[PDB]
């Protein structure tokens, strides 16, 4: 639908996500595609198919951020799946009626906003409309004003034409060498069809999956994706592998990211009117901890940074209502302070961090 | 069979011999029971079976993927798996590895072990090339490569399992 | 339903698959046999079923395709099932299931083409009464009908009326029945890795399998919501490497019910060069359209396409051979440059020639431990 060049794609992304610019570079060529498709005639349209990706890397690194800041760029419906949860069981058609039901309430609300604002005048008719909106139906006229019959029938091409998958963790269902092998290649079987360009029923309608893009993911530590069947290779022609996050990197994911974590407790001790102010050095330590943790016990890349920053703010968070209209700055004394006795104690960091 | 690591002034190496014996018989006498694991970043060594050791190998590069090269760390959870998968523990060998940080020996025990100054000696000439590597580690200059190339011709010229065929693979770090 | 002989279909298959021409003569008998049936009298119509076909060959080497293309040739319904989704669990009866909700949808959208030219005339001589209400076409109705199709709640009125219209153009009883009409004589069904379920405990389960899905090309009926479906007169195409297993080793009932056997070959690095360019709509060509869009000229050389199927066929032979599927996974590595680059380059013709091929992919193509990942 957008007309958004392969770079205007990752100069969006990189608002959000950190390096990785090779996965930033892959996923915009895939919704490049399909602004390409469009403009071919009526027999390459049908015979072109989505350029369907694999990421690689360790957990933590932004593989779904990447697919959720793409399907939020596009607009397009998104849903995530963990490719285990098929070994017990639910049927893998599931996938296509959440995604649906997803983009149902995505049109709807999305169509709500059309109908919201909708939702010569008296000198007398406007005084009491001034004071009406001064302070002292929404229902009736956004039901008046939706078509139902619209909202259905386009969250399905919603689907069918910008509908956006991502598999988490696909490596987990490769063949590890023979039980688990035939229910883990017994899910891949299943997932075929999906990306063969199958159809499947729902209640909301009739999907067609040819031109959905897909988005698997994982480690690939243990298996590796030529121990996916052949019939699964050849529908992933893009492969990307992401790189393992620096030091450098969770200073810059702590602050350069739009609405990044640290922006989002200065903006919540802002509403009990402190004022939060981090130093260089004090994000400098924050990234320092989180990696010291990582390498300590179990590494969860860039998600460790929540739960240390978390726990450094514990206090302040609690005491904000108290503490308003102060000025606190987080300073490096401050985080080695309510850190460094915790991250010290390996076992203590398994509980608290 | 019998392998050798030595480690001194920011160099570490693995030397095995070639010998295979099968009864009273020689079957192979230019088996390389010496490789490199990880991106060139480890040497390791194997006293058994070639195909066992192969399995363990590999295994043993994901745990380090998981665990970021740590060589101590994937040493423990490549034991705690080899006793404990009965497909694993059908396995015998004697895995010997090492990189820039340290030095250990992996058995099927479960068992992980780093020795005395990271001197590491197995096979059935095992203990006869630790004597040597012993004299000369304490009594001389002579670089881990001389060391342990020495070591493992003087337990050939004993051991009747172990030959002089010799692979090496040295680790600089400094 | 359509006329055609087997040479013209083996000819258009031409057009799409390279080679394997016994499994194209193979279809192309089935396929033939459905028009000779019709042809015949009461009681030779329900004697005579139809030849299904059991192709045999190592994965990627277009079995699907060639099932692929022919129903796409005829028209008819088609559905992938693989078998060994029944060894867990599903029914084997989804099978015609999803064959007929596949045909409903083929034959509505294919109605909707018909309809979205009647209904755009009706639709345009209704919104012509609002504009110009009665009392030859009058002059200010086509005064206004130009307006109307040099473009323009109105705008939104244009589209509702498509569906009263089209609605009041179609026959849903003529159409949700065209759909079993169309799965009962036209359509097919495309059962992958069929050698898996082939013979003590995974023997029952996988031969249970097989006596599950006997009654489908025996003979019988289902009940779907659509309607009450029968199964004799279905085309079937079975497909298994069979390296493990052999086709005798399926249950007796089985195999007298495939009496159209084929091998299909393993495809040559020549046969690679000619999937690049020969099929119309090759993977070549879409790549080339791709970038014609954004105003780029792409252009192979001959070496280079040379260069791209050695290419592919060096990854399936050094780690694990995936047939004619690598020549995708190979191409858009290459590609990924130009693909991301192709907005900047609007204007310029590229010439991906041998040199460029081996810059992009002898050193991805050198490294196996690499290749396993990227390719
Ligand atoms: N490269 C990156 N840039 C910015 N934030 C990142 C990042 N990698 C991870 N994060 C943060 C954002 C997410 O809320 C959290 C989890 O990331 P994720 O996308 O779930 O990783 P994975 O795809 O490995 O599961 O970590
Ligand atoms: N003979 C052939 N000609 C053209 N393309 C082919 C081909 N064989 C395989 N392909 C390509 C096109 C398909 O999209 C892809 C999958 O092939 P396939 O028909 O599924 O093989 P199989 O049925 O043996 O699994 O490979």
Same mark, same amino acid.
């Given at each position: 639908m957008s007309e958004m060049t392969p770079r205007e794609i990752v100069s969006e992304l990189d608002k959000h996500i950190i390096g990785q610019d090779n996965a930033k570079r892959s996923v915009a060529i895939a919704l490049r595609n399909r602004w390409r498709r469009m403009q071919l005639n009526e027999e390459l349209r049908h015979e072109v198919t989505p350029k369907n990706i694999l990421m690689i890397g360790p957990t933590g690194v932004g593989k779904t951020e990447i697919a959720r800041r793409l399907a939020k760029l596009a607009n397009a419906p998104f849903i995530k799946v963990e490719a285990t949860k098929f070994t017990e069981? =639910? $049927?893998? #058609?599931?996938?296509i009626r959440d995604l649906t039901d997803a983009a149902v309430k995505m049109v709807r609300v999305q169509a709500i906003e059309k109908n919201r604002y909708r939702a010569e005048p008296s000198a007398a008719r406007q005084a009491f409309r001034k004071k009406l909106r001064e302070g002292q139906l929404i229902e009736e006229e956004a039901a008046k004003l939706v078509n139902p019959e $619209?909202? =259905?029938? #386009? %969250?399905? #091409? %919603?689907? $069918?034409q910008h509908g956006i998958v991502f598999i988490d963790e696909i490596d987990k269902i490769c063949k590890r060498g023979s039980g688990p092998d035939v229910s883990r290649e017994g899910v891949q079987r299943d997932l075929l069809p999906l990306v063969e360009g199958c159809t499947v029923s729902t209640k909301h309608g009739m999907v067609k999956t040819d031109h959905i893009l897909f988005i698997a993911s994982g480690a690939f530590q243990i298996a590796k994706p030529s121990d996916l069947i052949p019939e699964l290779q050849g529908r992933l022609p893009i492969r990307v592998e992401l790189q393992a996050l620096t030091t450098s990197d969770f200073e810059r994911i702590l602050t350069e990211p739009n609405a990044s974590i640290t922006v989002q407790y200065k903006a919540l001790m802002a509403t009990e009117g402190v004022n939060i102010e981090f130093t260089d050095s004090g994000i400098k330590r924050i990234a320092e901890a989180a990696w010291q943790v990582n390498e300590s016990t179990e590494n969860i890349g860039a998600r460790r940074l929540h739960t240390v920053l978390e726990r450094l703010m514990e206090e302040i968070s609690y005491d904000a209502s108290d503490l308003s209209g102060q000025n606190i700055t987080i300073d490096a004394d401050y985080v080695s302070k309510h850190l460094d006795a915790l991250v010290a104690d390996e076992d203590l960091s398994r509980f608290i961090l | 069979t019998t392998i050798v690591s030595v480690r001194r002034n920011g160099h570490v190496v693995i030397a095995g011999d070639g010998q295979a014996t099968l009864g009273n018989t020689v079957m192979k006498g230019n088996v390389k029971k010496v490789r490199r694991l990880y991106n060139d970043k480890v040497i390791a060594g194997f006293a058994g079976g070639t195909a066992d050791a192969f399995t363990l190998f590999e295994l043993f590069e994901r745990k380090l993927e998981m665990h970021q090269g740590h060589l101590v760390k994937a040493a423990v959870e490549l !034991?705690?798996?080899?006793?404990t998968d009965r497909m694993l523990r059908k396995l015998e060998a004697l895995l010997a590895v090492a990189d820039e940080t340290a030095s250990l020996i992996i058995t099927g025990n479960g068992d992980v072990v780093q020795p005395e100054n990271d001197l590491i000696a197995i /096979?059935? /000439? /095992?203990?006869? !090339?630790?004597?040597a590597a012993r004299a000369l580690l304490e009594n001389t200059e002579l670089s881990a490569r001389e060391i342990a190339e020495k070591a493992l011709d003087i337990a050939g010229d004993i051991c009747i399992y172990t030959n002089h065929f010799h692979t090496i693979e040295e680790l600089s770090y400094k």
């Open positions: 069981g =639910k $049927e893998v #058609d599931s996938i $619209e909202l =259905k029938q #386009d %969250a399905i #091409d %919603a689907v $069918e | !034991a705690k798996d080899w006793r /096979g059935s /000439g /095992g203990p006869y !090339a630790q004597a």
